[PDB]
Amino acid sequence: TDLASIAREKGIEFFLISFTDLLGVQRAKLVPARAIADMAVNGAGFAGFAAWLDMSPADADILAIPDPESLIQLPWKPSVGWLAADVHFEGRPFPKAPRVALKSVLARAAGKDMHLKHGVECEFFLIQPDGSAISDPADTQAKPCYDQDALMRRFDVIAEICSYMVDLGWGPYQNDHEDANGQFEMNWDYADALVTADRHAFFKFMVKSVAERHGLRATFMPKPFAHLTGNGCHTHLSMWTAAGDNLFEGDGELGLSPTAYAFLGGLIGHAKGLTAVVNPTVNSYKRLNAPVTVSGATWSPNTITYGGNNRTHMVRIPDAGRLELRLPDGAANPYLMPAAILAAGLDGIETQADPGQRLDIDMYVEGHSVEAEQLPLNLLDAVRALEADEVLAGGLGAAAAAFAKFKRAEWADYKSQLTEWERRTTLDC
Amino acid sequence: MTDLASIAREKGIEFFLISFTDLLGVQRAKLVPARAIADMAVNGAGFAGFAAWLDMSPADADILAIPDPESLIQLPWKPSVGWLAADVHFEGRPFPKAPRVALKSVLARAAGKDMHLKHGVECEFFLIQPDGSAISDPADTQAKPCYDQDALMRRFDVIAEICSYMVDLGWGPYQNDHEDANGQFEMNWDYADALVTADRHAFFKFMVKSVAERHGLRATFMPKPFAHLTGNGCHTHLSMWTAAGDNLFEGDGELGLSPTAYAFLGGLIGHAKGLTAVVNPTVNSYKRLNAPVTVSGATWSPNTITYGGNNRTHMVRIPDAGRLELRLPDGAANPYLMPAAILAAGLDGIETQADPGQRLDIDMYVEGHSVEAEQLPLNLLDAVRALEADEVLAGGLGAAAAAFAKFKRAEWADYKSQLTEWERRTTLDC
Amino acid sequence: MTDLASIAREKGIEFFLISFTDLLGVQRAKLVPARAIADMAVNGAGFAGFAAWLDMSPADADILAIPDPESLIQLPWKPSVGWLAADVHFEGRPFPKAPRVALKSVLARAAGKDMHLKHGVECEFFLIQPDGSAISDPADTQAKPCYDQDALMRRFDVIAEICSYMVDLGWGPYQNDHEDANGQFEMNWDYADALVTADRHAFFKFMVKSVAERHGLRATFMPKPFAHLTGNGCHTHLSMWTAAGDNLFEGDGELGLSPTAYAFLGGLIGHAKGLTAVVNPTVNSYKRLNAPVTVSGATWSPNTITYGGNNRTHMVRIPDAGRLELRLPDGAANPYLMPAAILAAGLDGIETQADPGQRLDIDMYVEGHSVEAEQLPLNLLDAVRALEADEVLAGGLGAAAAAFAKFKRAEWADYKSQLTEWERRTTLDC
Numbered sequence A: 001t002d003l004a005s006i007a008r009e010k011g012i013e014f015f016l017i018s019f020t021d022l023l024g025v026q027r028a029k030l031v032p033a034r035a036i037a038d039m040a041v042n043g044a045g046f047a048g049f050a051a052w053l054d055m056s057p058a059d060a061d062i063l064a065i066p067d068p069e070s071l072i073q074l075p076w077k078p079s080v081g082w083l084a085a086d087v088h089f090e091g092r093p094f095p096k097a098p099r100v101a102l103k104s105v106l107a108r109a110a111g112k113d114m115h116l117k118h119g120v121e122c123e124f125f126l127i128q129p130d131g132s133a134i135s136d137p138a139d140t141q142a143k144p145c146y147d148q149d150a151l152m153r154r155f156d157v158i159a160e161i162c163s164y165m166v167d168l169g170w171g172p173y174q175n176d177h178e179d180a181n182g183q184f185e186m187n188w189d190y191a192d193a194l195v196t197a198d199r200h201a202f203f204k205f206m207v208k209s210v211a212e213r214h215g216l217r218a219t220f221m222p223k224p225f226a227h228l229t230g231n232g233c234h235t236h237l238s239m240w241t242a243a244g245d246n247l248f249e250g251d252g253e254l255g256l257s258p259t260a261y262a263f264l265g266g267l268i269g270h271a272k273g274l275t276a277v278v279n280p281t282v283n284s285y286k287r288l289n290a291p292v293t294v295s296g297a298t299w300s301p302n303t304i305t306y307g308g309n310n311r312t313h314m315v316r317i318p319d320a321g322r323l324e325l326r327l328p329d330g331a332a333n334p335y336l337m338p339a340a341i342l343a344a345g346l347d348g349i350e351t352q353a354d355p356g357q358r359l360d361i362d363m364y365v366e367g368h369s370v371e372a373e374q375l376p377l378n379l380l381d382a383v384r385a386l387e388a389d390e391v392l393a394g395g396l397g398a399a400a401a402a403f404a405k406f407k408r409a410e411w412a413d414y415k416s417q418l419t420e421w422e423r424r425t426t427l428d429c
Numbered sequence B, C: 001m002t003d004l005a006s007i008a009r010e011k012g013i014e015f016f017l018i019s020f021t022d023l024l025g026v027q028r029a030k031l032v033p034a035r036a037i038a039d040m041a042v043n044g045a046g047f048a049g050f051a052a053w054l055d056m057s058p059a060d061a062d063i064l065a066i067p068d069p070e071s072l073i074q075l076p077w078k079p080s081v082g083w084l085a086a087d088v089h090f091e092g093r094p095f096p097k098a099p100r101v102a103l104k105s106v107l108a109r110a111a112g113k114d115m116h117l118k119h120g121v122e123c124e125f126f127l128i129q130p131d132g133s134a135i136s137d138p139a140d141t142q143a144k145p146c147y148d149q150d151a152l153m154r155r156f157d158v159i160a161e162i163c164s165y166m167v168d169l170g171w172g173p174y175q176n177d178h179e180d181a182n183g184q185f186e187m188n189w190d191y192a193d194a195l196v197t198a199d200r201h202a203f204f205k206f207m208v209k210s211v212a213e214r215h216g217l218r219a220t221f222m223p224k225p226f227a228h229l230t231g232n233g234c235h236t237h238l239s240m241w242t243a244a245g246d247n248l249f250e251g252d253g254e255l256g257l258s259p260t261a262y263a264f265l266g267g268l269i270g271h272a273k274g275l276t277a278v279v280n281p282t283v284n285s286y287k288r289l290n291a292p293v294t295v296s297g298a299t300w301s302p303n304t305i306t307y308g309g310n311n312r313t314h315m316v317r318i319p320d321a322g323r324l325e326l327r328l329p330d331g332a333a334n335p336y337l338m339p340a341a342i343l344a345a346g347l348d349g350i351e352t353q354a355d356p357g358q359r360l361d362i363d364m365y366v367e368g369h370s371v372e373a374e375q376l377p378l379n380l381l382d383a384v385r386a387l388e389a390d391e392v393l394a395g396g397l398g399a400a401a402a403a404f405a406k407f408k409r410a411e412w413a414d415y416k417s418q419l420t421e422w423e424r425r426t427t428l429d430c
């Protein structure tokens, strides 16, 4: 059926034709039902220059072509229908647009009968509308993870959103209060990478929208509070044949196949550059200065290492037939992130990359001793690692170079800023 | 035969709170939609143990909290949610550091000797301002406020609502009182098998806190929340039953007690110091009014390792034939570790035919200065040392004891850096 | 022949400040009454080194700070007090981690080759509100404020007072300027033997801070105290003299320089990265305005490892025949470690006949994007790594280098936990 006919059936009065730009910003146009047919076929016009797409004011408008299978009637306002879209420029999918970049990598893998499936653990904070503190002043204890009281104190927003995911058929299965005061997580079933990526982009918008409707605010910022741990976006990954078999399932260590370990080998070999994409902000690189590893230290790995059922590494092996990449944070682009991961993975497969030795230790503690390689310490270094990484850069195409340019400009901006701390500690130098 | 998915459908349960109690008594829970409960009930809900008070490592596999379907409680103030108590499992086995698991281990040993602990709890709590700075009722001020009719009825709405919930839940509530301190209250219900009472105890605190907050108030089970007032006890009533339904404490001796009851009592006396660490488990548990002429609420807490008689002045009171009341525990006492440690002490007393000593039919707050009675530990650190040195208790509670002690010493080091306003005001001019 | 007790009597000195500079540039001092100075001058003033920035242990014997009687300065704003610079001694020997001692070691090596470093410092500073939140003069606002006559005279009282002090002290002050940033100032004086200039540098900062505060203001030598303004340089002028009084940098080559000057310059270029760590020693030292069209005060700091010519756009300027100006250092540069590290780099250049490369007679803020010039370290951690990897510098400064690096990494770990308002505002909606 066409979108126009569905608009009539479901009572949809407007569609949000939406695309994700290089910085993860949701760009959208609100079009009345009477216009969906024309837009569905010809796309909605946007001036790509006004988004983060590294285009020119003199370029022809991009046409964003809605994927009708992505359709989501806003559960809090069903008369509006959300669509994810592919940005086209001059008659071709635009390779700097993240969803397009992802579909390209997916296409290469599918051509080898390898279909990436993933699921995302999107931690977020519920905070005051002005952003200055968490939403619950009573959520204060040192180890608040899974706090029953605080969890239920936010039952209304959490349960409302969860029920929405049930109805949407995402298979939500748990809601938690996470490690930091004010921090939460709502998990749902993994799916085909494109499906999960669309849900991911929609989910952030749904959480922000519902929080705001309850007089609160949600943030997926990696390190919103100086005194608390950060928002991870830990990602679970597996590769499937079209016929429905999990290629990662095998008879090797921990129930993993050689394909799984070669994929993991790409993740390891490509970790430095991968960091730039999945920890994509200046803020992504801040850490509590704590010798005694906080309860939430696990939100982020420090070392290019794996694995085991061990939340202390860059890659965890939770179970047979999957890998968990713990590297990504809450700012990770829903499309660029799976795309860059897949590019690194496929390469590991094609080069039969060796992931090295599994470390069955606590990398936060007994891993000071080990000569494990360290992850990039800031945005600029991660970006340089990305540019120097030919497989990764070539994997993502022109998205990589445009991304790197935006991040360098953010870096320059950042370097003009003063922290209160440096003023306090240097004024009397 | 208890199928959670089917009950969710019958009763309109949209979410379950799969919950467990950690070593510090904190309620840890995950909110799972009904569509996920079958899987969770069989396999458990995963939690990173490191993130709770379980003395685990960041690198450990997640624990799996396996819900006890029999504990199910639809939240009376929000029936679409079903609360479940759970046993922490680690590496395919029950996790001995988890309080509910520690308790079940002791009960199993007792049950193997055909001895079944039943207890009831007197969970005093205060109703206070949301910011915690004062009691909830500024008109509750009189020097002797206990059982004040006015103040009690002024909080009729919160108390009656919670009591009605307990009626419907089948706990057999039978009385609600204003207790000894201004702002202090208590709601009693029927004793039951220890695990049943423990689960109810854990749920009860959550219910009182939740309902208070819905009414714009706050509840606290803190031992000594106000410097000018007496404290929250968790006085505990105890009896031991055969599988066939006989109360072993019932007998022909003094006050209607059997020698078994007296030997159990003997274990409580013998293990008192270490017991204090578990049932008075916070730095705050050791604060006391400095009054030369006693006080109305002095009874909230015993000072001496003594019993008994129908006398609220001792560590152990004999309220009636067939039971002992341990008056030691305070409101911070872990709902599971407390019955566990008490049972460990009492089983040892029975096994050794422990002698409880002389019953003192005197007022221990007065006449108990004279009597050469042994004093209870005066602070957290001394209690913790007595616990670590107590083989029966430490061994009885398993690894839970050592982890508990490590946590308490860390709290103690924290406490030792703090300054009271008093010491500043009285020492600044030294 | 310089007797402190006798001078105290002649000149009315009631107290001495026996002072030393630690690795972070902090002035450590003890206030001793005149009656004690003889003993202190011979034996030194005791300090617990652990309590200053000297990377020592609580268990170490106190260091003894032995005052250099020749450094004596009666505080011009309070002549009853006599300031003395001191060498830190530990276990009967000069302490190599102490900056003044580190500097004297390098000078001794240079002097052993009949090479005597003389330098002068351009110590920019801002005059600011006592609370540090803004510059001291709310009327100093114009986009190009450099040498503003109005704003300069509006602070005539503090500037003239300090200048007069420098006149009486014999430093040969010759000019006072409003510098490039609003609120920024500079007071120049004659170059001198390196140790003399270093002592004066240390005293000067203290004098400016002290006099500003007496006038209800505050002075700061912080590199980048205001986000909207350029920074405080400590541009340093350098020449090397024989004992007989000849300036070795003077010669017949380009711009009146000898091959010795060019080889010295070659060492500055070769050792630039590591040098950056010492003379730009704070996290704050690496902040910069983000302007596409340069700025009036852009010159406060070089971006590239290049020279030279009478050109304020490079890391090294050749102001005139017979000297080099290193523009690298900022206001946080340790008065002793900075000349020490510079001299270590320059002596190596002379020893290796280091090639400085091509002089660039261009505007490096503009035309220096094109030129394939090497960039200076972009942050503290990278500078520190370059320093640790620099054998000549690390070896030249001795244990002072390693301790310095340890301190800077610790500051860095501290910095990495901080959030700017900018990143919160631009990332909260990610």
Ligand SMILES: Nc1ncnc2c1ncn2[C@@H]1O[C@H](COP(=O)(O)OP(=O)(O)O)[C@@H](O)[C@H]1O
Pocket (backbone or CB within 6 Å): A117, A118, A119, A120, A121, A187, A188, A189, A190, A236, A237, A238, A318, A319, A321, A322, B046
């Ligand atoms: N084979 C798989 N491939 C990709 N993602 C998966 C796979 N299996 C599960 N996931 C997803 O991983 C995420 C985390 O699952 P979860 O069972 O909570 O992991 P764990 O309990 O081990 O931490 C969920 O979104 C889940 O659906």
Ligand SMILES: Nc1ncnc2c1ncn2[C@@H]1O[C@H](COP(=O)(O)OP(=O)(O)O)[C@@H](O)[C@H]1O
Pocket (backbone or CB within 6 Å): B118, B119, B120, B121, B122, B188, B189, B190, B191, B237, B238, B239, B247, B319, B320, B322, B323
């Ligand atoms: N045989 C028993 N064993 C354990 N607890 C009991 C027993 N009998 C009563 N209790 C419980 O003791 C608690 C207090 O009972 P209560 O009659 O109010 O004591 P009293 O009036 O003597 O002070 C209640 O929870 C009650 O159910």
Ligand SMILES: Nc1ncnc2c1ncn2[C@@H]1O[C@H](COP(=O)(O)OP(=O)(O)O)[C@@H](O)[C@H]1O
Pocket (backbone or CB within 6 Å): C118, C119, C120, C121, C122, C188, C189, C190, C191, C237, C238, C239, C247, C319, C320, C322, C323
């Ligand atoms: N031969 C020299 N060696 C070291 N420093 C010198 C030498 N000559 C002058 N200086 C010092 O350099 C600093 C700057 O001098 P100045 O004449 O104002 O430089 P310019 O005007 O070229 O920018 C002063 O402290 C000055 O005394």
